[PDB]
Amino acid sequence: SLNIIHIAAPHLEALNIATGETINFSSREDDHAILIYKLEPTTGMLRTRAYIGQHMPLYCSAMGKIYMAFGHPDYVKSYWESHQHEIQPLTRNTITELPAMFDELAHIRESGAAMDREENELGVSCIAVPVFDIHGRVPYAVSISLSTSRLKQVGEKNLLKPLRETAQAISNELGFTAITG
């Protein structure tokens, strides 16, 4: 994670300053996302309980859904079979049914973006994007967390633009090869 954080940190800090919001950066470790880097909000007021080293389940993490969306569909079926106990309705919005998840994953795979639409806690939303390697695999992902209230005010696409530009820069720099670096 050292090498990737060195590449990514200036870009993640920049996005943190530009949006004022929580910036999350994860890697995939099979059936969970690992939060390897996190910046707390500056002017943003929503602070999540997420922390560096946290393991985030794929089904309820926006970044985790990105990993599944760019993976094989057999993964999702076997994941549902083998994680029956772990897949739980955290809110009324959590995606707990396989058909619903496939529908969601198709949209993410097509658009290259995911949201957490209050699937972990009401009032908390996230927007996430993939960081591609040279082969179009997705080893890492970036997300912005903020209040659902604020997200409705500013708009997903409005925030998605700098978020994606941030991921693109990281991906481009990784391909070629900060205080928090």
Closest-CA residue to 4 (of 47, 32, 34)? 34
Domain 1-181 has CATH 3.40.50.1980: no
Domain ranges of the chain: 1-181
Element (H, E) at 116: strand 114-117
Which residues have a Cβ under 8 Å from the Cβ of 150 and sit 6 or more positions away?
A: 44, 46
Q: What is the experimental method?
A: X-ray
Query: CA–CA distance from 133 to each of 10, 60, 79 (Å)?
Result: 19, 24, 24
> Do the beta carbons of residue 93 and residue 117 sit within 8 Å?
yes
Query: Which two structure tokens, joined as six digits, stand for 8?
Result: 């990514």
